[PDB]
Amino acid sequence: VWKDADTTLFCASDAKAHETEVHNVWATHACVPTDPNPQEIHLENVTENFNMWKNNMVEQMQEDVISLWDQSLQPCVKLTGGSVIKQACPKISFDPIPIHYCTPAGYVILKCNDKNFNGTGPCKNVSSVQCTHGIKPVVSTQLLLNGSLAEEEIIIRSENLTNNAKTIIVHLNKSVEINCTRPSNGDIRKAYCEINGTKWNKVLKQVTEKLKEHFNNKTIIFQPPSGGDLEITMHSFNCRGEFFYCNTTQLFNNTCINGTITLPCKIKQIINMWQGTGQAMYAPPIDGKINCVSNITGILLTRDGGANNTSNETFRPGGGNIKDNWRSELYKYKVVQIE
Numbered sequence: 001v002w003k004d005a006d007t008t009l010f011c012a013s014d015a016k017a018h019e020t021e022v023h024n025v026w027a028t029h030a031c032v033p034t035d036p037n038p039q040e041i042h043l044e045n046v047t048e049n050f051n052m053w054k055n056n057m058v059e060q061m062q063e064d065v066i067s068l069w070d071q072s073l074q075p076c077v078k079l080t081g082g083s084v085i086k087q088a089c090p091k092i093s094f095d096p097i098p099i100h101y102c103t104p105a106g107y108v109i110l111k112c113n114d115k116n117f118n119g120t121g122p123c124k125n126v127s128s129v130q131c132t133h134g135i136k137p138v139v140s141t142q143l144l145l146n147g148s149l150a151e152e153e154i155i156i157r158s159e160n161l162t163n164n165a166k167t168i169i170v171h172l173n174k175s176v177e178i179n180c181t182r183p184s185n186g187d188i189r190k191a192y193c194e195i196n197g198t199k200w201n202k203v204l205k206q207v208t209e210k211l212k213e214h215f216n217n218k219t220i221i222f223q224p225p226s227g228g229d230l231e232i233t234m235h236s237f238n239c240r241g242e243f244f245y246c247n248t249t250q251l252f253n254n255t256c257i258n259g260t261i262t263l264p265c266k267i268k269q270i271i272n273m274w275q276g277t278g279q280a281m282y283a284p285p286i287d288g289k290i291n292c293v294s295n296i297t298g299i300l301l302t303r304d305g306g307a308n309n310t311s312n313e314t315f316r317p318g319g320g321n322i323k324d325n326w327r328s329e330l331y332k333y334k335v336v337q338i339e
């Protein structure tokens, strides 16, 4: 027998000890080797309830990623608590690797295998495992990158859809590549992201149809963020140690519902910390071509309020709470204590 419970997890990975890449370094000191032959027991006729929005695994991963960034991505100047911290800010090697989360003895991880599981409620197909799949701690806003894809239909996740204050996570069942480059050769901070318009608009259309299922067939409208910090109004992410801020207005217009979509981007040195601890300044971009090709596997949306007396629902790209990023991958897991 077992029961819902919280415990201190540990991590496993395939990090390389000789690698200077910061994720590899962190995992080499903070994790253990993965199990080449992991066991998974499928529970028969066992119904378990899950709540992705109240899952301590999320807080723990958040804590790891904060620790990793605090140890490997120190800015030149930190502005937190009214105090000023000046440190050395050397360029680093940066590229997220898969991190596994595992339970100690006496505990096990329950995994929901229902094809269209939305993250909350009962689950029919449950299995037990010692470790989650390899999860890359990719930090971003608006768009979820290099994540896992839904297996069947596109899934809509939210602690409470009726509450517009609750973030919506869109889980795609098909990747859409985004190609971001800061050309070698001028404005060293100028950059751009390219995206196949035909693929994107087709996916966004599918997302529209899915949202209809959850909103009584009301008309679904996309719009760019109304306000807020740059980290939220724009698609922000880290590519090779550099912070990219991309204008996604071209992605979220309802006109295309086919050529290459070119999003204007800029590399910023001064950032609002996702750890929510003030601002940070980093050194200028490294020389040469700075390029990252990522899979868009999910979208973070916020719904406009005050539309109850209309046939429209308005959705704008959002984010800013990186815990939602971890939820998008940890939704199917929960920890239980064994007898």
Ligand SMILES: O=C(NC[C@@]12CCC[C@@H]1CNC2)C(=O)Nc1ccc(Cl)c(F)c1
Pocket: 139, 140, 141, 229, 231, 232, 236, 237, 238, 243, 271, 272, 273, 274, 275, 276, 319, 320, 321, 322
């Ligand atoms: O600052 C952040 N969040 C906090 C706010 C989002 C919600 C309200 C908070 C007020 N300031 C913005 C943030 O995510 N920053 C941030 C920084 C770098 C990257 Cl790569 C990123 F993806 C996000």
Ligand SMILES: *[C@@H]1O[C@H](CO)[C@@H](O)[C@H](O)[C@H]1NC(C)=O
Pocket: 113, 114, 115, 124, 125
């Ligand atoms: C349970 O999981 C299996 C395997 O993925 C799937 O075929 C089935 O549709 C799911 N639904 C049930 C019956 O629990």
Ligand SMILES: *[C@@H]1O[C@H](CO)[C@@H](O)[C@H](O)[C@H]1NC(C)=O
Pocket: 146, 147, 174, 175, 294, 295
């Ligand atoms: C990008 O997505 C494709 C599937 O669409 C996958 O094969 C590939 O491994 C992904 N790359 C990542 C996650 O870095």
Ligand SMILES: *[C@@H]1O[C@H](CO)[C@@H](O)[C@H](O)[C@H]1NC(C)=O
Pocket: 151, 152, 153, 154, 155, 173, 174, 206, 210
């Ligand atoms: C993606 O999900 C949608 C429903 O949300 C479905 O219509 C479509 O067939 C799915 N595509 C793939 C690649 O499975």
Ligand SMILES: *[C@@H]1O[C@H](CO)[C@@H](O)[C@H](O)[C@H]1NC(C)=O
Pocket: 118, 119, 120, 121, 122, 156, 157, 158, 161, 214
């Ligand atoms: C997930 O499914 C449960 C019922 O199993 C339902 O109460 C909840 O509204 C669903 N979540 C979403 C976001 O649709």
Ligand SMILES: *[C@@H]1O[C@H](CO)[C@@H](O)[C@H](O)[C@H]1NC(C)=O
Pocket: 160, 161, 162, 163, 164
């Ligand atoms: C969901 O949000 C709505 C709107 O704020 C609220 O009225 C309702 O009580 C919430 N539902 C739950 C389950 O708390």
Ligand SMILES: *[C@@H]1O[C@H](CO)[C@@H](O)[C@H](O)[C@H]1NC(C)=O
Pocket: 179, 180, 181, 194, 293
């Ligand atoms: C990414 O886009 C750049 C645009 O300059 C292009 O040179 C490169 O071939 C693209 N890479 C992939 C994997 O499509």
Ligand SMILES: *[C@@H]1O[C@H](CO)[C@@H](O)[C@H](O)[C@H]1NC(C)=O
Pocket: 196, 197, 198, 199, 202
């Ligand atoms: C754009 O996407 C379509 C599929 O929707 C694909 O067939 C085509 O090759 C893509 N165009 C380019 C320029 O690669």
Ligand SMILES: *[C@@H]1O[C@H](CO)[C@@H](O)[C@H](O)[C@H]1NC(C)=O
Pocket: 212, 213, 214, 215, 216, 217
């Ligand atoms: C949306 O409209 C279709 C029309 O075929 C209907 O079948 C379906 O029940 C409607 N869904 C909602 C959530 O209103």
Ligand SMILES: *[C@@H]1O[C@H](CO)[C@@H](O)[C@H](O)[C@H]1NC(C)=O
Pocket: 233, 234, 247, 248, 249
């Ligand atoms: C994105 O680009 C559009 C078109 O140039 C512009 O109107 C809008 O203000 C930009 N968004 C942000 C957040 O700067």
Ligand SMILES: *[C@@H]1O[C@H](CO)[C@@H](O)[C@H](O)[C@H]1NC(C)=O
Pocket: 096, 138, 145, 146, 237, 238, 239, 240, 291, 292, 293, 294, 295
């Ligand atoms: C996504 O994965 C690809 C392949 O490993 C990588 O090149 C790219 O930099 C990743 N994107 C981000 C934002 O980390």
